[PDB]
Amino acid sequence: FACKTANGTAIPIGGGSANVYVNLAPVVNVGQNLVVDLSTQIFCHNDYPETITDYVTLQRGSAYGGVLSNFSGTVKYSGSSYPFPTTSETPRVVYNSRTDKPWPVALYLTPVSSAGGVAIKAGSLIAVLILRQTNNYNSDDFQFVWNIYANNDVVVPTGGCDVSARDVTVTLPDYPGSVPIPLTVYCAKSQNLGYYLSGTTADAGNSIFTNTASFSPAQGVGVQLTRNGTIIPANNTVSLGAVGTSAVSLGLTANYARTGGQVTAGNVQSIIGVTFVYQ
Amino acid sequence: GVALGATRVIYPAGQKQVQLAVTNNDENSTYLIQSWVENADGVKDGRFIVTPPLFAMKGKKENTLRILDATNNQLPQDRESLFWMNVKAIPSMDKSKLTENTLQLAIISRIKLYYRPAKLALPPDQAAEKLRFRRSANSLTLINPTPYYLTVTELNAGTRVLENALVPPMGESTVKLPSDAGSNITYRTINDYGALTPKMTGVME
Numbered sequence: 086f087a088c089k090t091a092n093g094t095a096i097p098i099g100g101g102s103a104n105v106y107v108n109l110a111p112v113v114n115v116g117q118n119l120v121v122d123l124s125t126q127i128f129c130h131n132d133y134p135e136t137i138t139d140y141v142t143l144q145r146g147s148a149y150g151g152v153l154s155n156f157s158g159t160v161k162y163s164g165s166s167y168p169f170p171t172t173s174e175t176p177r178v179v180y181n182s183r184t185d186k187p188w189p190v191a192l193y194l195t196p197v198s199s200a201g202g203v204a205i206k207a208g209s210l211i212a213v214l215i216l217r218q219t220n221n222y223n224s225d226d227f228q229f230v231w232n233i234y235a236n237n238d239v240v241v242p243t244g245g246c247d248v249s250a251r252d253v254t255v256t257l258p259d260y261p262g263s264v265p266i267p268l269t270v271y272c273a274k275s276q277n278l279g280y281y282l283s284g285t286t287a288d289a290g291n292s293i294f295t296n297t298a299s300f301s302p303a304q305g306v307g308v309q310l311t312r313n314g315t316i317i318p319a320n321n322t323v324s325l326g327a328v329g330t331s332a333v334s335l336g337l338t339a340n341y342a343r344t345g346g347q348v349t350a351g352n353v354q355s356i357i358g359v360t361f362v363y364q
Numbered sequence: 365g366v367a368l369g370a371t372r373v374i375y376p377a378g379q380k381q382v383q384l385a386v387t388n389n390d391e392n393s394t395y396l397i398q399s400w401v402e403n404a405d406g407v408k409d410g411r412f413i414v415t416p417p418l419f420a421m422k423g424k425k426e427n428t429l430r431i432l433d434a435t436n437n438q439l440p441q442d443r444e445s446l447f448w449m450n451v452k453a454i455p456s457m458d459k460s461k462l463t464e465n466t467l468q469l470a471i472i473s474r475i476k477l478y479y480r481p482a483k484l485a486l487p488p489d490q491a492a493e494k495l496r497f498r499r500s501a502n503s504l505t506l507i508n509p510t511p512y513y514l515t516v517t518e519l520n521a522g523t524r525v526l527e528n529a530l531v532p533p534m535g536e537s538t539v540k541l542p543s544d545a546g547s548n549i550t551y552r553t554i555n556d557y558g559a560l561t562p563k564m565t566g567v568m569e
């Protein structure tokens with residue numbers, strides 16, 4: 086029983102170890118699968134098929150470098166899947182031919198939301214796979230160790246941030262009242278954010294959002310947003326700085342402002358757009 | 365909580381279409397996704413079209429936005445052209461707060477979209493380095509001769525930390541030089557993957 090690498094290298098009868106060099110998808114997104122198919126690069130064969138039956142097993146599977154810190158994954162061995170890094174010696178597959186058959190092993194790796202840019206360095210030890218071979222002939226128990234190196238960087242693009250917002254705020258604090266506006270943002274990967282408001286305005290300072298509502302339009306008012314006392318006029322980019330894993334409150338408050346002159350009873354409703362700009 | 369799967373998009377000149385991911389976190393609350401692309405000046409020309417132009421995302425879901433090139437190669441072919449991708453999340457009217465004074469917000473994600481003429485020499489990886497300077501006692505002028513938009517971030521007059529800059533292709537930008545200077549100009553940039561390139565040293569031209 087011996088195995089060889091599609092690249093060239095072999096591990097002879099009795100076991101030993103070899104390097105397996107793999108080119109991986111250059112880009113993988115959070116949520117997706119990075120697939121390292123070794124069945125395309127590692128082959129074995131039985132040396133005496135007619136009288137001996139060989140049993141190949143995935144003894145152990147271990148992760149290194151980026152694979153270890155940026156991914157969660159499974160190992161598909163001969164049709165079935167298991168947790169990778171592995172936790173138990175896999176079931177045994179049989180080899181019965183002098184003809185080089187593949188070793189059906191594939192790594193299915195999915196980047197974590199926290200995965201940087203370069204989740205796997207070019208030239209790094211990505212994994213070590215231990216092939217254990219026995220037989221129905223004697224006490225032969227040999228190990229074929231495969232050291233999997235990545236030939237290139239596998240980048241995981243940075244995603245957009247999440248704008249955690251409760252919902253349709255009831256700016257009910259009757260005409261003079263003002264409420265705080267719960268709105269925070271967090272990013273799986275720290276990055277600079279900025280935002281600006283947008284919508285129909287009712288003033289020359291362009292910062293009092295027009296009253297939009299049917300039920301007897303409480304005329305003369307309008308909604309104005311403030312951030313810790315500072316007024317936010319439409320299309321004025323407010324720089325949030327670096328936003329990371331800890332949510333950042335924009336510190337918004339809805340305020341009533343007067344547009345025209347005579348204020349009048351009725352409802353006051355409004356829709357404002359908040360646009361987060363990514364660097 | 366609706367989020368885009370990228371903080372930017374590279375549109376390869378020629379591609380029939382590029383796609384972007386959108387995912388809605390809020391386990392319960394539908395949204396109307398309305399997307400569009402404005403040009404550098406902020407005007408909605410039809411250079412690029414997104415589909416579906418309007419659709420719903422109910423609860424935790426994931427869908428794909430596809431950006432279509434409408435610009436019949438009527439853009440400069442020696443450099444990238446700057447555009448802005450916008451994805452708006454439209455909530456729904458509560459028939460519950462109907463006779464109440466209410467305020468509704470519509471979150472929008474706006475990211476850069478570069479039209480990259482697929483036929484340029486200098487490979488993107490090899491662009492940040494080409495960044496030279498010109499530092500006075502108040503007017504440091506980032507200078508980019510390549511054909512890519514340089515998103516200069518973490519800039520420093522050696523010790524002093526400055527304000528980020530976006531340096532246009534074969535163009536330049538001047539960031540207010542504080543004078544708490546040095547010349548040990550330092551900066552990193554943001555690559556096609558919205559990833560920080562490695563810190564490099566300012567090299568005044």
Ligand SMILES: OC[C@H]1O[C@H](O)[C@@H](O)[C@@H](O)[C@@H]1O
Pocket residue numbers: 086087098099130131132133134137138139219220222225
């Ligand atoms: O291939 C069959 C047989 O070949 C050699 O004798 C050794 O590698 C054995 O361990 C193996 O069982």
